[PDB]
Symmetry: D2
Subunit: 483 residues, 4 copies
């Protein structure tokens, strides 16, 4: 089998907090560790962040760190005895005037006044990611009086949303502003914004991140009905980001699970067309929380995401809280490898008939065209400062390995989420100009990726100091004297 191209995002948590498990996850092949700021303390995150970077370096791997902002997720308050159980037909109330610590079998408090204002009789409310469902029977100034449609347990601080969406909330909370600073302070590679509705929400988050001196790239989580209402809404949000996440948990609540299949495919495609990275997420291997093997549906879900040409697939509870975090990563990685053998994973239309905007864009596209048609080419050596050039290369369907050669750590980590891209640390400026090409080829010969007789593509610009000036494509024969 070939080296896996689709990247794996693994959420960390109680089940993946020790050095022994993190080491095993690194070895199993995680490419990105997600730190969910909805839970844990700042120091818990710092400790994990330090440990993943240490253990990655220990094994010559490049793992990005993604920080996930909680967002304006609306939660219930606490219960007196920490949890309750509800049956179909039971009556239940959400009250702004009920004490936050005194939840009972009949009522719980909520610290969000506009919840009651935005809801009306008939609205369906979904709690704990849809596990419990209620319908609003009566509205008063301070509470919603409901009937349970689908029973189950309820416990402190569980999430609530309305079927259809449309709830008022700010995109950035005060917690999120603090977490943005925390992310900048930890030098996180990616930061994910929850529940954005339009480009403004992402621009605001970008402002705050730069103001805090953060260099992270921004991920827009597509979880709101308004974000997918039409192509302009979606494309606007995508263009304001560096990456997007198909956040199927909250999105499914907002638009209905029966609409997910079409929207997942649209989001991935529109992301790639706008030269952004895309992640597919949520319940991809849920059964592995309690089982050491996935279901056939789970295998199919992941494989189909790979054929949709997602950059990465994500684990949440499977890796953060479940009994088999390492086995989940292993299984996910194996399914990705299998799906990548399909003929549709390697054949491209190469954006025929379209208009290119930039010069560096053109060299990237020209290289993918060349590599996909001259099969003697076994690798692409992309000398890059910020990772932009191999971002463009990896938007094109191919099975050729793309190597991002960079001296910077920021870049070496960034590309870990790019489908088909591997990092090779390399500093061309600190070498005699005439020796750069053979030096780059040496790095692949060391690793056994290419041998004498194979061909390779090298891309670069004129200087080795500025960014955004890729303008050259060379096709080199491994074995020849390379200038």
């Amino acid at each position: 089998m070939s080296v896996r191209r689709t990247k794996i995002v693994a959420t960390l948590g109680p089940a993946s907090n020790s050095p022994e498990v993190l080491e095993q996850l690194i070895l199993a092949g995680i490419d990105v560790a997600r730190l969910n700021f909805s839970h844990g303390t700042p120091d818990e995150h710092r400790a994990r962040a330090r440990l993943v970077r240490e253990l990655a370096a220990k094994h010559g791997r490049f793992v990005a760190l993604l920080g996930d902002l909680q967002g304006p997720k609306i939660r219930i308050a606490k219960f007196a005895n920490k949890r309750i159980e509800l049956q179909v037909g039971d009556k239940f109330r959400f009250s702004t005037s009920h004490a936050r610590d005194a939840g009972t079998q009949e009522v719980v408090g909520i610290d969000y006044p506009d919840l009651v204002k935005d809801c009306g009789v008939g609205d369906e409310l979904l709690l704990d990611d849809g596990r419990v469902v209620m319908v609003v029977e009566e509205v008063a100034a301070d509470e919603l009086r409901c009937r349970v449609l689908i029973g189950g347990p309820l416990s402190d601080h569980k999430g609530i949303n309305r079927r259809g969406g449309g709830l008022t909330a700010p995109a950035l909370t005060d917690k999120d502003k603090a977490d943005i600073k925390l992310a900048a302070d930890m030098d996180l590679d990616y930061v994910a914004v929850s529940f954005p509705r339009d480009a403004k929400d992402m621009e605001y988050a970008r402002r705050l991140l730069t103001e805090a001196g953060g260099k992270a790239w921004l991920v827009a989580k597509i979880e709101r009905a308004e974000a997918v209402a039409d192509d302009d809404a979606l494309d606007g949000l995508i263009r304001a980001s560096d990456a997007v996440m198909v956040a199927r948990g909250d999105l499914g609540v907002e638009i209905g699970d029966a609409e997910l299949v079409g929207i997942q495919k649209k989001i991935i495609l529109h992301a790639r067309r706008n030269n952004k990275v895309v992640i597919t997420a949520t319940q991809m291997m849920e059964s592995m929380i309690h089982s050491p093997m996935p279901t056939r549906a789970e295998v199919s879900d992941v494989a189909n995401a790979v054929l949709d040409y997602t950059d990465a697939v994500m684990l949440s509870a499977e890796s953060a809280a479940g009994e088999y975090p390492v086995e989940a990563v292993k299984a996910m990685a194996r399914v990705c490898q299998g799906a990548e053998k399909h003929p549709t994973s390697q054949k491209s239309s190469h954006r025929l008939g379209q208009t290119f905007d930039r010069c560096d864009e053109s060299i990237a596209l020209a290289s993918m065209y060349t590599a996909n048609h001259f099969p003697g080419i076994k690798a692409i050596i992309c000398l890059t400062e910020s990772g932009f050039t191999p971002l463009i290369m990896s938007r094109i369907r191919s099975s050729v390995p793309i190597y991002a050669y960079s001296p910077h750590r920021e870049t070496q980590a960034r590309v870990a989420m790019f489908r088909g891209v591997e990092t090779i640390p390399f500093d061309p400026a600190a070498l005699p100009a005439e020796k750069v090409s053979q030096a780059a080829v040496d790095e692949l010969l060391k690793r056994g990726v290419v041998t004498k007789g194979d061909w390779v593509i090298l891309t670069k610009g004129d200087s080795y100091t500025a960014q955004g000036g890729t303008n050259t494509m060379k096709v080199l024969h491994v074995g020849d004297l390379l200038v």
Copy 2:
């Protein structure tokens, strides 16, 4: 929202044995009831068969009955209680001599004489489609003594295989020969053959079925590595059948779960190209055994099967043994409807450039072409004897309703598994020839499917008595005087 086109196969069992639940399944929209002959007594099947047909007729629905032969897959015997639970590290024994009804927590019997010959110390055994895994620690003359590697439940007649591959029975079992007679005696609409390897296995089954006077159509279950080894193997097996099933449980064990995605798609496509019906099966909504809603992976799995253009999707334990059989069917039906709104579900290339063989094939194809391009057409009235004509129509991607008008019950049930086809009972021979067209159009006007001003396609042959002579296509305006 439009009428669902993708068909639902629901396996019956303990959870779906009563008249109250079967009535609810019929109302929830099942199109085919599967009777798994691996479990239950002949009279249990007869009782369920009678009840489904009665309850379907009660609600003006046409539900086929599919009988699933156990096949030469090797199974364990019964337990004293029905089931046990095993933990990692537990010891367990498979014995040729142990009583077949007295299985315990420590040993179960097995009707496989070569057990000790085929297995050896170190071999891994897989039970229940890989869910439980054991390693052989000791071999004796009549038993295998094992340690559990992966725990889980075990129950009567669960499948067992060896990781190398050496468990199997040769060609059609004696049980199956008896069940073929039982199927013929019950007038089953479909019969499924397990573990077929090539056209010969299906021809043998067809011989036995016709010898017993059975009119059922044959379903080849694709579960053996040899059946998908190459296109000739697969196409041979498909051509010898009337329908095929993507049996992902056993198939995943035989070829590995990482290869399923590509093969599922190939099987569906090759089936449709050879004008056969295709079912996708196994663990599509497994979490609904214990939960009243599916996971996102399960939603995705089903939806993607619909976009692959499967005829039907299947439930096994979800409907047969689980806690929420009705909710599973409802959920599956809702996901199908959502996926059918996708633009790829309705647009066809119409087999351009290909060569047709038959005349009735040509009229079917010509009607789908016409309907897909003249949007005034709201339905296709296909007068058919055996259901062959609407079989061909439904191989072509479309969203136009196909109505199979037939006088025969055999046909009225058969087409229940055809994607996009609805039955309208109708006897053209018992009418004055000049009144047939308006009589057929009346049936759709009664049901509110078409109104005055809509157009319709009618297909038929010259006589109303023979089969295989469809040769006419008419385009009629609802409102006009129809000859």
Copy 3:
């Protein structure tokens, strides 16, 4: 070789006026005789019209008659001596005020009052169908002072036009109004309008033709720069007609020879898209005026028109005035047959993805689809009243013979210009309804077009009296008992 599908229009004149030559032209395969009203007396036309119809009937052929209106010719006045000769660089003047009777080597008069208003310095003037070319050097109050660009002879009443057009003239002259009546009186099948500018000119001609009781179909000659200025101009003119003619003589003068290739292709395509007939004309085999074989350029020109999917190709002086009218028709017919063997002549996209408007349109399209894919089909029996149904069929690329079965003479002749359509005289209303199918099939068996074992398509409507109700397509096996 197969029966030629592309139709041949042959202009009559002095070289093709006798019964012996007309008989030879009929036998050589002409499908339409063009009567150019620019020359000849009314009785000369009547005599030829009668003779072609007589001789066609004598040999079981269906030849249409097309009457070509002269239109608005702008001409110079007379020269004092009979003819003058000009050399490149010579000076020459056109004067509104000079005496029209005697012209000199330096100046000629002209009956064009707007001359000085319409023309300007730099304009190129083309005389005698482009044979002489001049450029306007100076404009004075009553004359244009020119330099000769291309020399040659000039004589009394030669035509003059301006590169670009914009000379004022009505499309219908008083002569043309008289000729429209003459055409109606002769029962001409087609009438061609010269120099129309827009749909209004064609609607006016249609009014006059119906007022005179004429049943002819109208041909718009695309000869004016204004007619091809943009798609709306062209499409408007096409939609107002039944057929169009790529009139490359005058059109080349108006837009320049270097623009012809693109516009010829556009006109043909837009005509077919709007379900109109199209003729390609002018100098297709000019060398055959004086030679018994065509040049390779002439062969190429005709063949390329056939691959552009023109309905017909035309001869003008080659058949009307030249030394080898019969040999020209024979050569043209042979080149058509050769080009029709090309793979692009028989393969169609079948208007996939498009939206159909009418029901009879749908049956026509459905038949071409069916015939192009079921190769057992050797003919299409199209029962038609007015020829509309086979008009639509013949817009689709195919090599299957289309037979227009009609009782009417108007229709039997009309379809002679339709590519791939042959007339079979037939009256279904005068037969017992149940015997029609086999009666139609008999007509093809008589002619040896189909034999026992071949298949055929029959199209018709419900009654045999009304027009515009084709709604049925049947596929029949020649040899079976046909109802």
Copy 4:
């Protein structure tokens, strides 16, 4: 309009022998002068060759010289009185036994032993390039007895051929071997072989040319039925050549005029696929022998050759013997420019799905891909030694100017026949390496082809001395500091 891309080959002769006319032809835009060795003396050719090269240099143009070998004619013997005249309907005989000097009004001898074997009753025989045509009425053991179909004169040693071809003769005659030496001695850029049958004939010609020290590229004239008998025959002959010519005069005789259109298109396409140059020839503007303007058929013929994507179009008698050689070239050039504006002239599929063989091939293809999609690119600077790299570039449909930068005269002339390629004399080896790019860009700035702000593609290899090592593509912004 833009600069013409399709190249013009003009045959020289009595009408184009003077310095005044040659100068006018150079200024009118000829790209290649053809020296037909069938006529003229060695010194007549030398004088013309010297004059075209002198006059081209005088006007900064690069005109190749093509030498056309006469090849094999089969000829009749002598007449008693040197010539006779034959009329339509006359009887005439060709006899293998009749005295070779005593030809009469009724019979002539012939030194063709297989005459009776090769010809048969019904065959048409063409003498003196088609001036006389006969049909064979009877065959006897030593003669063919014929009827004259087309009359004319006959004289000693006139050529004879059969419709259908198949007469035995070797591709290279003794005259041709002498002319190969003459071509080498004159340093001709191209040599054309007449009536080759297969790769062997072209390899033999290449041997003789190299043996004589000739550097010319070889043109295979496709005129023999055997050369187009199937794809292997044709492709074999193409692969053994550098260029091919669609020789429609002799080819039409050998396969029939009705087959030319399809074969012209096949030859052009197969030539381009195998990376060869292709010329379309013969009677493209024949009427211009005696007229100063072409017919519409001639305009169409040339334009359609341009849309078929021929590299060049040729004139023979139009430029060599006719009354208007300069006007013919001007007209041909104008028609080419018009046809090049068509949208199909600029859009390419870019050999999607295909497999490339070489590295320099890959850079050429990658540049055409890049140029066709980044419209900021206004030119391609191709540094080439032998012209191979811009040969490959020009196989791809585009409207971007391709500039072949070369120091060698051999190369500067060679590319004159390549569609869309212009020569820029340039010696990169004689410059400081760091100044090459801006030096090349200066050459285009001098000529006003590009301005500040435009982009350009530059291709090259590592050294500036070896051939066959193009391996680099750069995209440069005109105005920036170019390394």
